[PDB]
Structures are given as structure tokens and as C-alpha cells.
């Protein structure tokens, strides 16, 4: 039998878990705690008329896709910002406390919904409106659709007028500086044909942040929404990186340092949240764990289970180009957080797109639960999964934290010390509520593929626990079901054997 010791000390290493790590980009069958309006379609979205452009995703079409996909009623298609107000209204109706709205920085937004934009209609042209961050004339709630410009501060003003500012109960809390700027010239060449420079990205980020914060001083600015590691390192070989990056280990440090400098000159914080996208490059069984992975490939599934360790564990070297060539930047979350500490202390960290794959397989659910445990433990502020409602095991992984009992039961909001003797076969995360250890929550993941694992728990707490109720999912179902409670707790010790490939949430009282 495989035997693993779990040691918890409810008084030790206490740290808040940000509530907003359990979010999504799409409409999921899960209770989520943040919603992001972002990704490729948001770069060219025009709040005045709701048109947007597919870019490379579909023939550079300008059309009504976001109206249709967001479920906006036809009677509101010509109402300013109806894509965004439907998106936020839906989030509020689902009791989601954080909405993150992407603002447009690549330079232009769709003028029309008339179909493909030719290369000869690359902006500026009749097919586009130029974005300015500051109107510099009085705002209107009925923006002028006939002129040549779309104003970001006027868009924010419309939202704040409707919902209140970000400090209020219904306000939109965060705005993103566009999406994947190092891919603008690939995804949106008809808006931004040139490869983005580091200098342009800082100039725009600073200017947009200033413009937003004049309207809503409480709103959080997120950037740069980088697509993946090569953008973290060099802004995708940006044309000015050889000069701008002198003395910087990677583009992340340059971005933090320059946003801090601009904030110090301005006299207020202009970057609230360092925002990146992380689609694992980890491979197993001869393929990446996401983007077309075969769920029959057991070696891929095993690699998916271990891949979350690249986020935090210095001993884990994944099979990928990042694991091979970029060891100096792994594990990735401590590297990002260390950069924040060195170059812009107090900046938060968000993972605004990610997907570990296997979302309809038990290993996608276990990996998802592991990732959410890591985000909480290591201090990520906000995270939003990218993927649809067919990812039933990913959704179970989210609900294990946000709604394990179907009536709103949730993981605690204060992380506490919880160590496993075998980080390969298992993960375990523990939390309490506020400062109170009366209820101790434990997420316990058995990564053993084809055998049970016996866990010997030893807990140091101010309480003497007498029952552990249990909810779990497994290969039999992604529905989270209540299991027999743990009852033989002797001096805050117990033994609990869990079947192969099972994810559990234990609630001790
Ligand atoms: Ca206009
Ligand atoms: Cl990018
Ligand atoms: Zn689903």
C-alpha cells in the first residue's frame, strides 16, 4: 500500500486566499468568482456600436459576433456598451463579485459590421475608428457614432454611470490593457500590422491607465495580458528589446520597472495587477497536455497531473521547451512574484487565461483543483480559466472550491500550513475562515493512477475535531457527491484511504 503523511498546523503560515482566483472567461457550469471579458475578440470591440473583428480567427471579419455570442437581445444591439453591460449584468445575476473588462489599446476598433476587412483597409481606413484614451471634451452617454474616434475614458464613464465606481457593490472592479499585445501583429494585423515595441506598449499602458483612473480612481488596471512565455521573456522578440531590455533579465522586469517609474512620476499607482496567460507547454506521451490532447494517452494524462508543479515546485522539470531552456525562470509563479518584489512591490498577480487540458477527463479535474490550490496558497489575486462548458471535470475542480455541496459551501479564505510527504502522488491544501479554525477545510488530491493512497493526517489546531464531512469527484462522475464522514479522530489524527484519481474536500469540525 502507498502511505502518505499529511501534517497541518492551523496556526502557521496563515495568509488570505484572494476570492477572485476561481473565475472564468466563458459561461461555465460552475460557481465562479470572477468573470473576464477578454481574449482576441475584445481588441477591436467598439463600445459605441458593439461591432468587433475576428482577426485571424475568421478572415478579419467585422461583425455582430460579440452581440450574438453574449446573448444580447436584438433590441439592445445599437445601445452603447450592450455587449459589456449584458456581460456584467449576467455576472451580477450569478453573484460574481469581480468583473474584469478589456479596454482597447491596439489602436483602432471596428467601424461597422460589414464583413471582411481587406489588407488594403488596414487601419486607418473607413473600416476602423481610431481609439483615443482621453476625450478631452465633456463625456456623453450617447457617444457620437459619426465621428472618427472612440474614447476609452468615455466608455469607462458610461459603465461607472450605470453601475457605480469600482468601490461600490455593483461596480466593475478591473480593466485590462487590451489582450496579447505581442500577438497584435499576428492576430490583428489589420489593426496593428507592426510588431509591438516595448516603448509603444509602455506609452499606451501608462496613458490608458491615467485616463481610466481619472474617471474611476478605484478601478484596478491589469496588464499586459501576455500570451505566453516568449512574450514574458522578450515581448516576442520585440524590435526594440535589444535596446530597451539592456540590464533586464526579462520583459516582465522592464514592464514592472517602467510602470513603477511612470506611477512615481504621476503620483499614483498605474499598474494594479500583472496579468499573464499561461497555457502549459508540458508534454507527456509525445504531445502537449492541452490543445488537441488525446484523453486515451495515459502518459499525457500522467503529465497533466504533474504539470501544475511547474507553477511552484523548484524540483520539478517538465518535458517542454520551457523546462529545457528556461530553467532560470522556473518555477514560474515564484519568478513572477520575485520580479514584482524587486521592481514594483505591492503589484498583484493574475492568470487571466489558462487551460491544463483534459477538461472532460478526471485528470483535467484533478489538475484544475491542484492549480486552484496553488493559486490560493502562493498568492495569486485573480484567475480566469479559458474554455467552454463541455469541460465538466474542470468545472468540478472549480466547484470543489466554490460550491462543493450545491448550496454554496466553499473552501476557506485563509490558507494554513499543510504539508504532504509525497508531492508526486498527492497534493493537499488547507484553509480556515477568517481568523477562526473552528472549521478546517482540506482539499486532498490523489494523483495515483491505478492504486488507492492511504493518508495519515496529523493536525495541530486550537480545536479538537470530531467529524470530517467529505465531498468528492472521481472517474465515476464529475458530479461532486457527499461521501461517508470521517469519524475516528484521535487527538486530531486520523487515517483516510482514497481511491486512485480522486479529488476530495474534507470539512473538519
Ligand atoms: Ca465616436
Ligand atoms: Cl502577448
Ligand atoms: Zn459543463
Residues placed in the known binding site for Zn(2+) = 29, 389, 395
The CA-to-CA distance between both ends of the chain, in Å, stands at: 29
Q: Which of 258, 445, 411 is nearest to 343 (CA)?
A: 258
Four-point Cα dihedral 23, 297, 307, 415, nearest 10: 50
**C-alpha cell of residue 264:** 512615481
Q: Looking at the structure, tell me whether residues 131 and 253 fall in a common domain.
A: yes
Q: Looking at the structure, tell me whether residues 391 and 417 fall in a common domain.
A: no
Last residue of a domain, one of 378, 405, 432: 405
**C-alpha cell of residue 4:** 502518505
Q: Looking at the structure, tell me whether residues 8 and 22 fall in a common domain.
A: no
Taking the CA of residue 462 as centre, how many other CA atoms within 13 Å lie in the half-sphere pointing to its CB?
A: 8
Compute, in angstroms, the gap from residue 146 CA to the centroid of ligand 1: 6
Q: Looking at the structure, tell me whether residues 231 and 380 fall in a common domain.
A: yes
The reply to whether 424 belongs to the active site is no
Last residue of a domain, one of 386, 405, 424: 405
Tell me, what CATH number does 197's domain have? Answer: 3.20.20.80
Measured CA to CA, the distance from residue 327 to residue 313 in angstroms comes to 12
Q: Which residues does residue 387 pair with via DSSP β-bridges, in sequence order? A: none
Compute, in angstroms, the gap from residue 124 CA to the centroid of ligand 1: 14
Which ligand has the nearest atom to the CA of 399? 3
Residues placed in the known binding site = 29, 48, 144, 147, 149, 389, 395
Which ligand has the nearest atom to the CA of 390? 3
DSSP class of residue 185 equals: H
- Contact present, 359 and 391 (Cβ < 8 Å): yes
Q: Which residues surround ligand 1, an ion (CB under 5 A)?
A: 144, 147
Question: Which backbone phi and psi does 269 adopt, to 5 degrees?
Answer: -65, 130
Question: Which backbone phi and psi does 495 adopt, to 5 degrees?
Answer: -120, 135
Compute, in angstroms, the gap from residue 225 CA to the centroid of ligand 2: 6
- Cα-Cα-Cα-Cα dihedral sign, residues 303, 306, 310, 311: positive
* CA dist 174 → 171, 261, 379, 464, 496 (Å): 9, 22, 18, 42, 42
| Three-class HEC string of 49-72 | CCCEECHHHCCCEEECHHHHHCCC
Measured CA to CA, the distance from residue 156 to residue 142 in angstroms comes to 13
Q: Looking at the structure, tell me whether residues 340 and 432 fall in a common domain.
A: no
Measured CA to CA, the distance from residue 382 to residue 376 in angstroms comes to 9
Residue 181 DSSP SS3: helix
Q: Looking at the structure, tell me whether residues 430 and 399 fall in a common domain.
A: no
Compute, in angstroms, the gap from residue 409 CA to the centroid of ligand 1: 46
CB atoms within 10 A of CB 506: 25
Q: Which residues does residue 223 pair with via DSSP β-bridges, in sequence order? A: 274
Q: Is 476 exposed, middle or buried (0-12, 13-18, 19+ CB in 10 A)?
A: exposed
Measured CA to CA, the distance from residue 130 to residue 111 in angstroms comes to 9
DSSP class of residue 292 equals: S
- Contact present, 221 and 174 (Cβ < 8 Å): yes
Which ligand has the nearest atom to the CA of 137? 1
Compute, in angstroms, the gap from residue 180 CA to the centroid of ligand 1: 25
Q: How was this structure determined?
A: X-ray
2-9 vs 453-460, strand pairing mode: parallel
Tell me, what CATH number does 460's domain have? Answer: 2.60.40.1180
Compute, in angstroms, the gap from residue 278 CA to the centroid of ligand 2: 11
Number of structural domains the chain divides into: 2
**C-alpha cell of residue 26:** 466563458
Compute, in angstroms, the gap from residue 456 CA to the centroid of ligand 3: 34
Which ligand has the nearest atom to the CA of 128? 1
* CA dist 118 → 114, 150, 190, 324 (Å): 11, 21, 8, 41
What is the domain range of residue 3?
1-17+406-509
**C-alpha cell of residue 53:** 473583428
- Please spell the DSSP secondary structure of 403-446, one letter per residue: -TTSSS----SEEEEEEES-TTTEEEEEEEETTEEEEEEEEEEE
* CA dist 46 → 79, 114, 171 (Å): 12, 14, 21
Q: Looking at the structure, tell me whether residues 397 and 421 fall in a common domain.
A: no
Which ligand has the nearest atom to the CA of 224? 2
Q: Which residues does residue 63 pair with via DSSP β-bridges, in sequence order? A: 52
Measured CA to CA, the distance from residue 204 to residue 197 in angstroms comes to 11
Measured CA to CA, the distance from residue 424 to residue 312 in angstroms comes to 13
CB atoms within 10 A of CB 492: 18
Measured CA to CA, the distance from residue 369 to residue 371 in angstroms comes to 6
Q: Looking at the structure, tell me whether residues 207 and 108 fall in a common domain.
A: yes
Catalytic residue among 180, 200, 281, 353: 180
Q: Which residues surround ligand 2, an ion (CB under 5 A)?
A: 180, 182, 226-227, 231
- Contact present, 507 and 409 (Cβ < 8 Å): yes
Four-point Cα dihedral 397, 400, 406, 411, nearest 10: -140
Name the CA radius of gyration of the chain, rounded: 23
Residues placed in the known binding site for Ca(2+) = 48, 144, 147, 149
- Contact present, 233 and 325 (Cβ < 8 Å): no
User: Cell numbers 512565455 correspond to what residue?
Assistant: 229
Q: Looking at the structure, tell me whether residues 164 and 225 fall in a common domain.
A: yes
Compute, in angstroms, the gap from residue 383 CA to the centroid of ligand 2: 17
Experimental structure resolution, Å: 1.0
In 143-205, the DSSP E strands lie at 149-151, 174-177
Q: Looking at the structure, tell me whether residues 450 and 435 fall in a common domain.
A: yes
Measured CA to CA, the distance from residue 495 to residue 419 in angstroms comes to 15
* CA dist 410 → 9, 81, 406 (Å): 20, 33, 10
Last residue of a domain, one of 372, 405, 438: 405
Q: Is 76 exposed, middle or buried (0-12, 13-18, 19+ CB in 10 A)?
A: middle
- Contact present, 157 and 139 (Cβ < 8 Å): yes
Measured CA to CA, the distance from residue 248 to residue 269 in angstroms comes to 22
**C-alpha cell of residue 284:** 507527456
Q: Is 26 exposed, middle or buried (0-12, 13-18, 19+ CB in 10 A)?
A: middle
Q: Looking at the structure, tell me whether residues 12 and 76 fall in a common domain.
A: no
Q: CA geometry: angle at 186 spanning 252 and 364, to 5°?
A: 65
User: Cell numbers 499529511 correspond to what residue?
Assistant: 6
Q: Looking at the structure, tell me whether residues 378 and 440 fall in a common domain.
A: no
Measured CA to CA, the distance from residue 146 to residue 161 in angstroms comes to 23
273-278 vs 348-354, strand pairing mode: parallel
* CA dist 416 → 7, 12, 202, 312 (Å): 11, 6, 38, 17
Amino acid at each position: 500500500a502507498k502511505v502518505v503523511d499529511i501534517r497541518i498546523d492551523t496556526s502557521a503560515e496563515r495568509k488570505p486566499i484572494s476570492p477572485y482566483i476561481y473565475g472564468s472567461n466563458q459561461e461555465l457550469d460552475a460557481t465562479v468568482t470572477a468573470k473576464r471579458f477578454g481574449g482576441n475578440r475584445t481588441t477591436g470591440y467598439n463600445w459605441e456600436n458593439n461591432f468587433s473583428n475576428a482577426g485571424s480567427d475568421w478572415l478579419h471579419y467585422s461583425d455582430t459576433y460579440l452581440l450574438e455570442d453574449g446573448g444580447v437581445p436584438k433590441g439592445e444591439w445599437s445601445t452603447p456598451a450592450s455587449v459589456v453591460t449584458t456581460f456584467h449584468d449576467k455576472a451580477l445575476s450569478k453573484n460574481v463579485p469581480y468583473t474584469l473588462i478589456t479596454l482597447q489599446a491596439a489602436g483602432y476598433v471596428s467601424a461597422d459590421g460589414n464583413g471582411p476587412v481587406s489588407q488594403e483597409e488596414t487601419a486607418p481606413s473607413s473600416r476602423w475608428k481610431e481609439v483615443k484614451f482621453e476625450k478631452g471634451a465633456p463625456f456623453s452617454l450617447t457617444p457620437d457614432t459619426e465621428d472618427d474616434y472612440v474614447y476609452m475614458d468615455e466608455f469607462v464613464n458610461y459603465l461607472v454611470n450605470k453601475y457605480g465606481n469600482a468601490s461600490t457593490p455593483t461596480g466593475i472592479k478591473g480593466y485590462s490593457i487590451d489582450n496579447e499585445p505581442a500577438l497584435w501583429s499576428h492576430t490583428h494585423p489589420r489593426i496593428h500590422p507592426d510588431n509591438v515595441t516595448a516603448k509603444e506598449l509602455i506609452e499606451k499602458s501608462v496613458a490608458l491607465s491615467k485616463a481610466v483612473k481619472k474617471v474611476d480612481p478605484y478601478a484596478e488596471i491589469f496588464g499586459p495580458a501576455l500570451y505566453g512565455f516568449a512574450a514574458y521573456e522578450t515581448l516576442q522578440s520585440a524590435p526594440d528589446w535589444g535596446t530597451e531590455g539592456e540590464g533586464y533579465r526579462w520583459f516582465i522586469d522592464y514592464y514592472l520597472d517602467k510602470m513603477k517609474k511612470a506611477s512615481d512620476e504621476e503620483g499614483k499607482r498605474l499598474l494594479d495587477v500583472l496579468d499573464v496567460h499561461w497555457y502549459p507547454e508540458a508534454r507527456g506521451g509525445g504531445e502537449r497536455i492541452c490543445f488537441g490532447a488525446d484523453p486515451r494517452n495515459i502518459e499525457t494524462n500522467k503529465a497533466r497531473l504533474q504539470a501544475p508543479r511547474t507553477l511552484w515546485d523548484p524540483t520539478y522539470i517538465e518535458d517542454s521547451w520551457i523546462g529545457q531552456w528556461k530553467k532560470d525562470f522556473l518555477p514560474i509563479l515564484p519568478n513572477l512574484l520575485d520580479s514584482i518584489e524587486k521592481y514594483y512591490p505591492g503589484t498583484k498577480l493574475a492568470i487571466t487565461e489558462y487551460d491544463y487540458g483534459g477538461g472532460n477527463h478526471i485528470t483535467g479535474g484533478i489538475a484544475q483543483a491542484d492549480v486552484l490550490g496553488i493559486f490560493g496558497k502562493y498568492g495569486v489575486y485573480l484567475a480566469t480559466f479559458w474554455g467552454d462548458a463541455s469541460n465538466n471535470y474542470t468545472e468540478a475542480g472549480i466547484n470543489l472550491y466554490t460550491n462543493y455541496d450545491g448550496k454554496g459551501g466553499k473552501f476557506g479564505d485563509t490558507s494554513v500550513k499543510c504539508e504532504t510527504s509525497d508531492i508526486e502522488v498527492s497534493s493537499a491544501y488547507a484553509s480556515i475562515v477568517g481568523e477562526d479554525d473552528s472549521k478546517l477545510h482540506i482539499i486532498l488530491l490523489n494523483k495515483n493512477y491505478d492504486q488507492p493512497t492511504t493518508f495519515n493526517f496529523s493536525i495541530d489546531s486550537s480545536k479538537n475535531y470530531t467529524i470530517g464531512n467529505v465531498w468528492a469527484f472521481d472517474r465515476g462522475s464529475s458530479n461532486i457527491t457527499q461521501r461517508t464522514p470521517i469519524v475516528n479522530i484521535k487527538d486530531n489524527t486520523f487515517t483516510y484511504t482514497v481511491p486512485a484519481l480522486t479529488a476530495c474536500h474534507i470539512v473538519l469540525e
